[PDB]
Tab-separated table of C-alpha atoms in Angstrom:
chain	number	residue	atom	x	y	z
Q	3	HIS	CA	128.854	157.407	27.525
Q	4	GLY	CA	132.023	155.522	26.626
Q	5	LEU	CA	129.977	152.794	24.857
Q	6	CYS	CA	127.436	155.461	23.956
Q	7	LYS	CA	130.137	157.190	21.938
Q	8	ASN	CA	131.261	153.915	20.555
Q	9	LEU	CA	128.202	151.836	19.586
Q	10	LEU	CA	127.432	154.995	17.466
Q	11	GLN	CA	130.866	154.502	15.671
Q	12	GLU	CA	130.257	150.788	15.098
Q	13	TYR	CA	126.768	151.906	13.849
Q	14	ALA	CA	128.458	154.665	11.780
Q	15	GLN	CA	130.513	152.100	9.749
Q	16	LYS	CA	127.686	149.392	9.761
Q	17	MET	CA	125.788	152.013	7.969
Q	18	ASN	CA	128.689	153.594	5.702
Q	19	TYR	CA	128.739	156.913	7.300
Q	20	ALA	CA	131.468	159.359	8.469
Q	21	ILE	CA	131.597	159.313	12.329
Q	22	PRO	CA	129.427	161.216	14.708
Q	23	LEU	CA	129.880	164.749	15.399
Q	24	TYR	CA	129.022	166.215	18.873
Q	25	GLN	CA	127.842	169.694	19.511
Q	26	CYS	CA	127.111	171.578	22.528
Q	27	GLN	CA	124.608	174.550	23.332
Q	28	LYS	CA	123.537	176.743	26.171
Q	29	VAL	CA	120.692	178.440	27.640
Q	30	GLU	CA	121.531	181.055	30.336
Q	31	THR	CA	118.848	182.596	32.584
Q	32	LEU	CA	119.069	186.145	34.008
Q	33	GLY	CA	119.336	184.645	37.557
Q	34	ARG	CA	121.258	181.377	38.292
Q	35	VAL	CA	120.574	178.780	35.523
Q	36	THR	CA	122.629	177.043	33.007
Q	37	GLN	CA	121.312	174.254	30.968
Q	38	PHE	CA	123.288	172.474	28.226
Q	39	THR	CA	121.588	170.894	25.208
Q	40	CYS	CA	124.128	168.432	23.211
Q	41	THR	CA	123.693	167.054	19.786
Q	42	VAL	CA	124.902	164.081	17.893
Q	43	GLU	CA	124.961	163.963	14.073
Q	44	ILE	CA	125.301	160.829	12.318
Q	45	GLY	CA	124.320	160.239	8.700
Q	46	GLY	CA	122.655	163.633	8.105
Q	47	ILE	CA	120.467	163.746	11.042
Q	48	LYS	CA	121.208	165.623	14.314
Q	49	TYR	CA	119.769	163.764	17.208
Q	50	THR	CA	119.093	166.147	20.318
Q	51	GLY	CA	119.277	165.327	24.006
Q	52	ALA	CA	117.054	166.589	26.657
Q	53	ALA	CA	117.937	169.768	28.426
Q	54	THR	CA	119.832	169.286	31.755
Q	55	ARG	CA	122.332	171.124	34.021
Q	56	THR	CA	125.542	169.070	33.442
Q	57	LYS	CA	127.271	168.180	30.223
Q	58	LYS	CA	127.409	164.485	31.018
Q	59	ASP	CA	123.757	164.123	31.529
Q	60	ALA	CA	122.905	165.834	28.376
Q	61	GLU	CA	125.868	164.218	26.496
Q	62	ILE	CA	124.281	160.901	27.177
Q	63	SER	CA	120.598	161.680	26.710
Q	64	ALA	CA	121.570	162.906	23.276
Q	65	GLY	CA	123.394	159.761	22.600
Q	66	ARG	CA	120.267	157.730	24.020
Q	67	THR	CA	118.326	159.606	21.431
Q	68	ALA	CA	120.582	158.526	18.764
Q	69	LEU	CA	121.025	154.745	19.799
Q	70	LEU	CA	117.079	154.453	20.335
Q	71	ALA	CA	116.195	155.801	17.052
Q	72	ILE	CA	118.604	153.673	15.350
Q	73	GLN	CA	117.286	150.564	17.128
Q	74	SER	CA	113.848	151.112	15.407
């Protein structure tokens, strides 16, 4: 999370871009369920996290998508 947020700022400078913008979304069932999908935009590419029930989870998946794409 912390480091997730940061390595991506490092990578945003190591590449010349304008800082990662985080977004959040929701899907809410008629009966009980709330699942947040989170997003990270760096470069001009939005990277999308898995759907989960808790924002930390998805905040991180979203980042794990961002770093792992970057790596390759």
